[PDB]
Amino acid sequence: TSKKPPNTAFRQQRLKAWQPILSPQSVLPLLIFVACIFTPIGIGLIVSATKVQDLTIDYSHCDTKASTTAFEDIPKKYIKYHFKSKVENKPQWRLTENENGEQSCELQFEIPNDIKKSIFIYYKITNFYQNHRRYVQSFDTKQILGEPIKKDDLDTSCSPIRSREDKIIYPCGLIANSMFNDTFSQVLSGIDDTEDYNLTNKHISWSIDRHRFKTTKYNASDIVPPPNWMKKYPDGYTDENLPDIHTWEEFQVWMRTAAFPKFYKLTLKNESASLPKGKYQMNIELNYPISLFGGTKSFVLTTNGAIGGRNMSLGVLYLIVAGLCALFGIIFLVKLIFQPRAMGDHTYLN
Amino acid sequence: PRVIHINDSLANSSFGYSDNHISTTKYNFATFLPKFLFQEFSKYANLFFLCTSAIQQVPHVSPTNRYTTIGTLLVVLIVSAMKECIEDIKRANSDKELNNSTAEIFSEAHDDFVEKRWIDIRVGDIIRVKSEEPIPADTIILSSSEPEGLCYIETANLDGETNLKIKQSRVETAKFIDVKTLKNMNGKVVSEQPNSSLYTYEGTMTLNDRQIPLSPDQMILRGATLRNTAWIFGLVIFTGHETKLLRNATATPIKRTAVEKIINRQIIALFTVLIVLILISSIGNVIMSTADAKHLSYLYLEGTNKAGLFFKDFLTFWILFSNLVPISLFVTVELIKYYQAFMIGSDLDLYYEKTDTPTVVRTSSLVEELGQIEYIFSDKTGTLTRNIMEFKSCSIAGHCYIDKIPEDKTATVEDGIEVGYRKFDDLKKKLNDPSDEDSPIINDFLTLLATCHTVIPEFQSDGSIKYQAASPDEGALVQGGADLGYKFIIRKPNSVTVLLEETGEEKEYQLLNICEFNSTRKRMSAIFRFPDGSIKLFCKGADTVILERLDDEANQYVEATMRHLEDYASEGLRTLCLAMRDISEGEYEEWNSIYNEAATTLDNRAEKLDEAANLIEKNLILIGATAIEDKLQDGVPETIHTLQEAGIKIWVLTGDRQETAINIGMSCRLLSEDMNLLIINEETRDDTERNLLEKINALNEHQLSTHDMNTLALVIDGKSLGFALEPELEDYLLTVAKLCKAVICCRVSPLQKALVVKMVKRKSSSLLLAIGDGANDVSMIQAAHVGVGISGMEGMQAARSADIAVGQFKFLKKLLLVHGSWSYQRISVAILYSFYKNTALYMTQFWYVFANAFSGQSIMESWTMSFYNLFFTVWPPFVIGVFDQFVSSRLLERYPQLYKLGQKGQFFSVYIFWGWIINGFFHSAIVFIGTILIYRYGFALNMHGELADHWSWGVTVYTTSVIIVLGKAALVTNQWTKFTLIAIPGSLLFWLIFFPIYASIFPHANISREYYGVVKHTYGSGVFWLTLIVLPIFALVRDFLWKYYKRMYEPETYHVIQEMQKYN
Ligand SMILES: CCCCC/C=C/C/C=C\C/C=C\C/C=C\CCCC(=O)O[C@H](COC(=O)CCCCCCCCCCCCCCCCC)COP(=O)(O)O[C@@H]1[C@H](O)[C@@H](O)[C@H](OP(=O)(O)O)[C@@H](O)[C@H]1O
Ligand SMILES: *[C@@H]1O[C@H](CO)[C@@H](O[C@@H]2O[C@H](CO)[C@@H](O[C@@H]3O[C@H](CO)[C@@H](O)[C@H](O[C@@H]4O[C@H](CO)[C@@H](O)[C@H](O)[C@@H]4O)[C@@H]3O)[C@H](O)[C@H]2NC(C)=O)[C@H](O)[C@H]1NC(C)=O
Ligand SMILES: *[C@@H]1O[C@H](CO)[C@@H](O[C@@H]2O[C@H](CO)[C@@H](O)[C@H](O)[C@H]2NC(C)=O)[C@H](O)[C@H]1NC(C)=O
Ligand SMILES: *[C@@H]1O[C@H](CO)[C@@H](O[C@@H]2O[C@H](CO)[C@@H](O)[C@H](O)[C@H]2NC(C)=O)[C@H](O)[C@H]1NC(C)=O
Ligand SMILES: *[C@@H]1O[C@H](CO)[C@@H](O)[C@H](O)[C@H]1NC(C)=O
Ligand SMILES: [Mg+2]
């Protein structure tokens, strides 16, 4: 019956609230506080990123510009290194070949400082667009779980490499077919009274990848290798040639599509002992040609820090924010000191 | 030809006529989709996203899931559908409440009147219509309680005339009063086909003996209202949509605001920039895929069909960028407007107590215009006045008597003839004793006040007698003449009884004949016979018509009456002169014969009866004059001054003459004592042209000073306005009216009240507000941009057709200053921000085509992007568009000039839309470069040397984007209530809690398999909780410092008003 609206703090738009004012006495302390809390964080982050000791060797073109009879020096254009001390001997490299053109690049470097942190070894690839749309979605996730999917039920996303010669290609996709296949030494062969340094090859991928990549339930007379794996698996698949994507951890590491054409991929690691100083040697079986993607392969030996490893983006961001805050907290201060606003009155601006 | 039976409900039903059910619903449960889908896809964004979803169904083209956009499309579609259904149910509620009323219908079997509903009313049934109830349908009258068969109908709903029409029944069939005699009557009624003409009717009724013709003189429409009649017997002919009034129903045209057109322009701009980005990306893609055909051999490109690979690439970016045009906005804006209309139509300061009528915003699509009004086309009778008459003063025998004597001129100076103000006590003290000469004249006047009228008396159980008059002025005259002792009581036909409270005895006079009122003569005569044997004729009229036929040698108070009319007309009081004359029997018989000769000629009534009554009106003895006031509503002189101070021009359409309108405008504080009046009152069109030319040249020949431009007003009558609305002279009137601050139109014709509005909006860009009451100006309310209807005594015809329904005028000071400046500052920020939070996200989809070789790779997940527009960024817009107040209402009424800030358009434009867009671009680039500088090779983790990837980086991008969007929202808001804490930090915590649960549960159901193990590598990583701290501050320091600078060293008006509000 009655049409009178209620009298409450909500229906009458009378809710209690707070009015944020930007007085200088409430802004300048905020800026100086932000500066005083972002300077120590920034210097701590740059100190943490400074203590990372790493090494990188561009072993691309080793089959063309590296000697064969002796260990010649590596051009300074290729090598990079950051250590806590000075390196006395420049890294060198040599080429070797065995039977059927099995080329190999032998690098020799010198670790002048006892690295107490755990050692990691990656291969760095450049100009490889894994983030390509046609390339990132081209892999069947059911076969990764290990199931005998028929031909007419395969994922149509891996279309160019699907059912060759009327047989279900087992690793359907462009990510598996284009796998990086340069085998590493799995040990830093010490030279001149320096003991070796074994490296672990397992537990390098993601736990969920080890849990989802299951051993295949396929046979061997109804599947064919991808066109790029026919060199290692000739005459097709057999009962023994058939791999297992569960234990094959490098396959799982490669199947993690990266975001940028400059990416690392974990290959080896060692977290059980310190790496002493001395001369070490690493062998790489050159199988992957750089002419396929026009990039530059690299062997990287790094450690880990609180942020990652030799990267000062976060520290410089913190320092830039602190510097801008401390600069404006002086600009506005001297501006209000030398010439106040003198316009607090309304003066009937209407 | 329509043949209708008289008392056969089953015989006439074979023709299959319409039902009496009146339906006003928009949708129904039978054909809801075939029209709702068309209405929803008749727009731009809906059809665009439908085409996008249709394109997204081709293979190897969609960069995201196939159902990532059609889901949001169906969500917004069902939201729109449920809102349409809610409003349609709210309409159907009142529709069914009005359509199920009771009706007394005759029964063939029962042979009596039974109560039924309007739904079951069929054509051909006999009904009994009682008093003070609306007409059910188009019924022909059979009989009535009156002996002759006449009744009174009021056209307050079907037309604009307030007078009562007398509809008489056929004398050959009005003898059926009882029900038991209604069974022996047979026949058929041949009526015309359903049309829309009102006063044209033709038919033929078959009676028991002979057939009779039909005419609109015995036909009552549905929109009429019966009055002063006990009961009528009606036979229905037209029902439902087959009537004469409800057949050609009017449809209110959708009013498009300026904000809508600015939104359309911004949408076109977004579409253009979308096409630009798509074309740039496609060209880059094709040139990179053609120039590097050797370094991309591991992708197994087509080659021979690369041309086709161009087209399939184009679409690939379209979808990827289709999120640049937000579809959630077209529903968020209307929901915000709905909530604002609800919160406005529920305020106490806009609620009327003496009538129980709150503000009812009938159209919630016009809420933001209240903050940008420049013209107000107002009414006077009803909108400015209380529309209730009150007997104020009387002047007889050359004296003046009022109840409230003001101290300005109470002491009569006696400068020759007596001039001044006296009380009614002196009138009684000079009337009681018969020794005074004017006492018989006072008796004649006090009897004329209670005898010459045509008011119907009604007695009640309480004893208070009620008066029913066709006009309020006659009722006020009767009330002012009755309260002193000469009351008007029971009036039997052909005589008038007057109760004398001074003596205690009731007298009675024989009313011989009365003449009807005329608009041209503006007079009314009535002859009476007294028990003393004298025949006396009374005559009432205007001040400029009857005074010309007086006897200057008989009356000695002519100049006194002229002065009493002049000083009363100077205050806006309606004046009426009363005169009398004694006649003999011979001239009385001659006048009776002339009246009979005039009544025998039914062809001429307007001129014949007037000339017959004026045949004896050759000389009269003037008794005196009466003056009735009509006060203004409370607060109008303050609200009008406050609106003028805010910078709004008012055009008062007054029905009075020049001087009366000028005086009531000066009393209403519309004008002033120094406002130069540009009077334009001329009959010759050429003279009006010359006057307009003189005005415009005298105005343009010199500069307009600040004091001279602010102090100008215009006054124009009815004929001058009708001559100044021609297509050849309208420009002069418009350019002379755009300079003055207040316009006053006098003697305005009803329909012309619309032509003054439809002439401005077609030749200007300002927004109009037409406030009025009654039906006579309803066409005005449907003509301006914002229509306002007052609830008054003229009927509810204007409130049911206005965009806003307000109880009185005083509320406008708060409806426009507070509920406008807010309603324009909110929605604007609720739209610009709606374009920012989108650009701050999906623009990272464009800066990424430089890293994925121009392929079109989604940086983020397919469903998280779809949930960005539904769950995490949908409440800050509502909070800033419904609950935000940039300035308090206590200071928004003290300084009305702030209204100008919304009157020009300083809060919503394309120049600010582009600023918001480029700010979004800047923030997107900031977050993109900051994320790619940290995830350089993915080697930014500390968990046993494991590396991040694509999705573990897209998640950080999305999180930083939403954090910066919420920080911008927090920087924009002014009112920190509780809904703000629920909207901004509430949404932040909602995302922070929803991401782990989703990414841990849903991947196991084949919904988002790209989130396996990302929760650990995101949350457990020590760099996530550092970039989330270092990037939003780095991106919002610019906005913070710019806000501080603009507030401190380059303020505005409200920037100082907010400081005064904070510190005082
Ligand atoms: C390592 C180097 C670090 C450099 C760091 C530099 C930071 C600052 C950079 C530039 C700023 C330059 C000068 C800063 C000084 C003044 C800026 C003036 C800004 C300006 O008036 O218009 C603004 C737009 O603002 C941009 O749209 C801002 C425009 C910025 C766009 C820049 C051009 C595009 C950049 C794209 C780069 C992409 C490159 C590609 C990289 C990726 C490629 C892969 C307007 O919007 P607004 O929200 O403020 O509007 C205000 C505001 O709402 C409120 O503060 C006001 O009330 P009150 O104040 O009374 O409370 C109110 O009245 C209203 O007026
Ligand atoms: C490490 O990874 C390298 C890059 O993926 C890979 O190098 C490629 O290996 C494939 C496999 O042999 C090569 O593809 C063959 O090339 C030869 C010419 O050299 C073609 O004749 C051959 O086509 C043949 O066609 C026959 C008839 O259709 C068919 O019966 C044969 O089975 C065969 O398919 C292939 O096209 C490719 O050229 C190599 N280079 C590049 C740049 O791709 C290494 O083999 C791999 N090494 C190991 C040890 O896994
Ligand atoms: C990590 O490196 C250390 C250092 O070489 C390895 O420890 C050696 O393991 C070999 C096993 O063949 C032993 O013969 C050596 O005596 C160990 N060194 C010392 C100082 O005790 C360790 O095995 C490596 N971790 C792996 C391979 O997982
Ligand atoms: C630890 O390092 C030693 C030194 O290289 C590894 O011993 C070699 O093992 C390979 C694999 O069978 C042989 O071909 C070499 O002849 C071995 N060399 C020597 C000097 O023994 C040893 O295998 C490593 N530990 C593990 C667990 O692999
Ligand atoms: C493997 O064995 C034969 C073909 O070698 C076939 O009948 C069978 O279905 C294959 N798959 C499994 C799971 O046994
Ligand atoms: Mg009115």
Query: β-pairing, B225-227 with B535-541?
Result: unpaired
Among the candidates B199, B215, B242, a domain finishes at B242
Residue A219 CA to ligand 5 centre (angstroms): 6
Residue (of B1011, B964, B997) closest to B863 by Cα position: B1011
Q: What is residue B498's DSSP assignment?
A: E
Whose C-alpha lies nearest to ligand 2, atom 4? Answer: A288
Strand partners, B535: B529, B583
Answer yes or no: is B248 within a domain. no
- Nearest Cα to B963, choosing from B886, B858, B1034? B1034
N- to C-terminal Cα separation, chain A: 45
Measured CA to CA, the distance from residue B955 to residue B861 in angstroms comes to: 8
* Catalytic-residue membership of B582: no
CA distance B69 to B53: 6
8 A C-beta contact, residue B976 and residue A19: yes
Beta-bridged to residue B166, according to DSSP, are B152
Taken as a whole, chain A contains a residue count of: 350
Domain that holds residue B402: 390-629
* Residue closest to A126 by CA, chosen among A260, A301, A300, A295: A295
**Closest to A278 in 3D by CA, of A186, A189, A187, A185:** A189
Query: CB contact, 8 Å: A34 with chain B?
Result: yes
A324: number of Cβ within 10 Å? 19
Q: Do A269 and B945 touch (CB under 8 A)?
A: yes
**CB distance B658 to B612 below 8 Å:** no
Where are the alpha helices (H) located in B484-557, listed in sequence order?
A: none
**CB contact (8 A) between residue A332 and residue B939:** no
Percent of residues in chain A assigned helix, strand, coil, to nearest 5:
25, 20, 55
Q: How far is CA B702 from CA B284, B698, B732, B738, in A?
A: 63, 7, 18, 17
Pair B370, B819: CB distance under 8 Å: yes
What's the angle, vertex CA B320, arms to CA B1017 and CA B335, rounded to 5?
Answer: 95
Cross-chain CB nearest to A317 (options B296, B353, B1030): B1030
Contacts of B858 (CB under 8 A, 6+ apart): B63, B64, B320, B845, B865, B954
Lookup result for tokens 């120039």? B291
Distance from chain centroid for Cα B871: 37
**Residue pair A31/A326 in contact by the 8 Å Cβ criterion:** yes
Query: Comparing C-alpha atoms, which of B371, B981, B272, B638 is closest to residue A17?
Result: B981
Resolution of this entry, Å: 3.0
**Residue A126: Cβ within 10 Å count:** 18
DSSP B872: I
Both tokens of A264, joined, read: 């690392």
Judgement on whether residues B222 and B289 belong to the same structural domain of the protein: no
Measured between CB atoms, does A207 come within 8 Å of chain B?
yes
- Looking at the structure, tell me whether residues B778 and B698 fall in a common domain: yes
Ligand number nearest CA of A289 is 2
Count of C-beta atoms within a 10 Å radius of residue B239: 25
- CA atoms of B336 and B80, how far apart (whole Å): 13
Listed in sequence order, the residues at least 6 apart from B461 whose beta carbon sits closer than 8 Å to its beta carbon are none
CB atoms within 10 A of CB A175: 21
Tell me the nearest-neighbour CA distance from B852 into chain A, angstroms. 5
Reference B980, options A12, A13, A21, A17; nearest CA is: A17
Domain final residue, candidates B771, B787, B814: B814
Site of tokens 């209405």? B39
| Long-range CB contacts (within 8 A, 24+) of B670-675 | B670/B640, B670/B644, B670/B742, B670/B744, B671/B713, B671/B742, B672/B711, B674/B711, B675/B711, B675/B712, B675/B713, B675/B741, B675/B742
Cα dihedral B40→B41→B44→B48 (10° resolution)? 130
In this structure, what are the phi and psi dihedrals at residue A155, rounded to the nearest 5 degrees? -65, 125
Beta bridge pairs of residue A266: A122
Q: Among candidates B729, B699, B711, B719, which has minimal Cα distance to B658?
A: B719
Separation CA B652–CA B637 (nearest Å): 13
Residues at the binding site of B are 379-381, 474, 517, 519, 522, 540, 574-575, 654-656, 747, 753, 773, 776-777, 968, 1038, 1042-1043, 1054-1055
Whether residues B382 and B395 share a domain: the answer is: no
| B472 and B599 inside one domain | yes
Strand runs (DSSP E) across B730-775, as ranges?
742-745, 768-772
Q: At what angle are helices B951-972 and B910-932 packed, to 10 degrees?
A: 140
Ligand 3: which residues within 6 Å by Cβ?
A 197-200, 270, 272-273
Asked if the Cβ–Cβ distance from B1037 to A317 is below 8 Å, we say no
DSSP letter assigned to residue B3: E
Residue B159 corresponds to which tokens in the numbers above? 């037309």
Tokens found for residue B175: 């003898």
Rounded distance, CA B865 to CA A341, Å? Answer: 46
Q: Which of B1047, B1035, B1052 is nearest to B836 (CA)?
A: B1035
Tell me whether residue B600 is in a domain.
yes
How many whole angstroms separate alpha carbon A308 and alpha carbon A50? 11
> Breaks in chain A follow which residues, C to N over 2.5 Å?
none
B300 to chain A: closest CA residue: A160
Q: What is the CATH number of the domain that holds B781?
A: 3.40.50.1000
Cross-chain residue pair A308–B297, CB shorter than 8 Å:
no
| CA B813, chain centre distance (Å) | 16
Domain assignment present for B1015:
yes
Q: Which residue in chain A has the smallest CA separation from B939?
A: A308
CA distance B177 to A263: 104
Experimental method: cryo-EM
Q: Are residues B291 and B303 in the same domain?
A: yes
DSSP E strand stretches across B615-705: 621-629, 649-653, 676-680
Cβ neighbours for A200, distance < 8 A, ≥ 6 positions apart: A268, A269, A270, A271
Q: Give B139's strand partners.
A: B220, B236
Strand ranges of the sheet holding B523-529, from the earlier edge strand across to the other edge: B390-396, B621-629, B574-583, B535-541, B523-529, B506-514, B496-500, B486-488
Chain A: closest CA distance from residue B434 (Å) = 56
The answer to whether A23 touches B377, Cβ cutoff 8 Å, is no
Distance from C-alpha of B812 to C-alpha of B809, rounded to nearest angstrom: 6
Buried b (16+ CB within 10 A) or exposed e, B832-866: bbbbbbbbbbbbbbbbbbebbbbbbbbbbbbbbbb
- Ligand whose nearest atom lies closest to the CA of A185: 4
Q: Do B297 and A264 touch (CB under 8 A)?
A: no
What residues are paired with B1004 via a beta bridge?
none
* A2 contact residues in B (CB cutoff 8 A): 356
Three-class HEC string of B195-253? CCCCCCCCEEEECCCCEEECCHHHEECCCCEEECCCCEEEEEEECHHHCCCCCCCCCCC
Give B622's strand partners. B579
CB distance A301 to A118 below 8 Å: no
The β-bridge partners of B770 are B377, B787
Find the helix or strand (DSSP H, E) in which B836 lies. Answer: helix B821-842
Task: Let me know: does A249 contact A204? Beta carbons within 8 Å.
Answer: yes
Q: B225 to chain A, minimum CA–CA distance in Å?
A: 25
Q: What SS3 class is residue B547?
A: helix
Domain boundaries, chain A: 25-44+315-334, 54-304
DSSP state of B726: S
Pairing of strands B523-529, B535-541: antiparallel
Residue B1052 lies in a domain: no
CB-count exposure of residue A111 (10 Å: 0-12, 13-18, 19+) = buried
Task: Give the integer Cα–Cα distance in Å for B1049 and B983.
Answer: 31
> Is B1045 within the bounds of a domain?
no
Which positions ≥6 away from B385 have C-beta within 8 Å? B630, B631, B632, B633
3-state secondary structure of B680: strand
d(CA B661, CA A39): 75
CA angle B573, B574, B578 (to 5 degrees): 125
Q: Which of B299, B323, B347 is the last residue of a domain?
A: B323
Counting from 1 in the atom list of ligand 1, the atom nearest the Cα of B918 is 27
- Which spans in B17-163 are helix H? 33-41, 45-55, 70-99
Residue with tokens 């006031």: B629
Residues 6+ apart with CB under 8 A from B520: B610
Note the Cα B340 to chain centre separation in Å: 17
Q: What is the count of structural domains for chain B?
A: 5
Token readout for B128 is 């009994």
Does residue B512 sit in helix, strand or coil?
Answer: strand
Residues of B in Cβ contact (< 8 Å) with A16: 977
Q: Are B383 and B406 in contact (CB under 8 A)?
A: no
Paired sense of beta strands A266-270 and A119-124, if any: antiparallel
Chain A residue numbers with beta carbons less than 8 Å from the beta carbon of B300 are 160-161, 174
Give the whole-angstrom CA distance, residue A27 versus residue B940.
34
Tokens of A102: 């099995």
Distance CA A232, CA A246 (A): 19
> Which residue of chain A has the CA closest to B1030?
A318
Contacts of B864 (CB under 8 A, 6+ apart): B955, B958
Q: Is residue B922 within 6 Å of ligand 1 at its C-beta? A: yes
Q: Please give the full DSSP string across B765-825, using - where no structure is assigned.
A: -S-EEEEE-SSTTHHHHTTSSEEEEE-STT-TTTTTSSSEEESSSTTHHHHTTTTTHHHHH
- For residue B914 and ligand 1, the question of a CB distance below 6 A is answered with no
| Residues linked to residue A301 through DSSP beta bridges, in sequence order | A55, A121
The one-letter amino acid code at B866 reads: S
Q: Mark whether B479 and B612 lie in a shared domain.
A: yes
Looking at the partner chain, which of B933, B1051, B1060 has a beta carbon nearest the beta carbon of A343? B1051
Q: In B923-959, which positions are buried (b, 16+ CB within 10 angstroms) versus exposed (e)?
A: bbebbbebbbebbbbbbbbbeebbbbbbbbbbbbbbb
Report the atom number in ligand 5 closest to the C-alpha of A220: 5
Which residue's CA lies nearest to atom 8 of ligand 5? A219
Question: Do B535 and B564 share a structural domain?
Answer: yes
In this structure, the answer to whether residues B707 and B744 fall within a common structural domain is: yes
Q: Do B357 and A308 touch (CB under 8 A)?
A: no
Please list every residue in chain A whose beta carbon sits closer than 8 Å to the beta carbon of residue B1013: 206-209
Burial B548-585 (b: 16+ CB within 10 A, else e): ebbeeeebebeebbebbbebbbeebbbbbbbbbbeeee
CA–CA distance, B1064 with B1058 (Å, rounded to integer): 10
Angle at B728 between CA B724 and CA B733, to 5 degrees: 40
Contacts of A88 (CB under 8 A, 6+ apart): A110, A112
- Please indicate, yes or no, whether residues B163 and B267 belong to a single structural domain of this protein: no
Which of B59, B300, B343 is facing A160, going by the closest CB pair? B300
Alpha carbon of A182 to ligand 4 centroid (Å):
20
Encoded tokens for B1045: 């600078």
The C-alpha atoms of residue B767 and residue B757 are separated, in whole angstroms, by: 11
Residues 6+ apart with CB under 8 A from B752: B718, B721, B722, B725
Do B175 and B84 have their domain in common? Answer: no
Q: Which residues contact B29 (CB under 8 A, 6 or more apart)?
A: none
**H helices within B504-618, ranges in order?**
558-569, 585-600, 608-614
Q: What single string gives the DSSP state of each residue in A112-180? A: -S-B-SPEEEEEEB-S--TT-HHHHS-B-HHHHT-----GGGS-TTS-TTS-BTTBEESS-BHHHHT--
Structure tokens at B1058: 């907010």
Q: Residue A123 forms beta bridges with which residues? A: A299
Active-site residue, selected from the candidate residues B138, B313, B379, B610: B379
- Same-domain check for residues B234 and B216: yes
Cα(B996)–Cα(B1013) distance, integer angstroms: 10
Is B618 inside a domain boundary? yes
Ligand approaching nearest to the C-alpha of A199: 3
Going from the C-alpha of B925 to that of each of A258, B850, B858, B866, the distances in angstroms are 21, 12, 16, 21
Tokens of B622: 């003037």
> Could you give the CA distance from residue B466 to residue B477 in angstroms, rounded to a whole number?
14
- Angle (CA) B523-B527-B531 rounded to 5° is 150
CA–CA gap between residue B1032 and residue A333 (Å, rounded)? 24
Distance CA B1041, CA B1052 (A): 17
* B1058 within domain boundaries: no
Domain presence at residue B875: yes
Task: Give the tokens for residue B353.
Answer: 């107590």
Q: Are residues B559 and B674 in the same domain?
A: no
Mutate to test the interface with B, among A23, A155, A260 (most CBs of B within 10 A): A260
Residues 6+ apart with CB under 8 A from B447: B486, B498, B509
The distance of B818 to chain A (nearest Cα, Å) reads 12
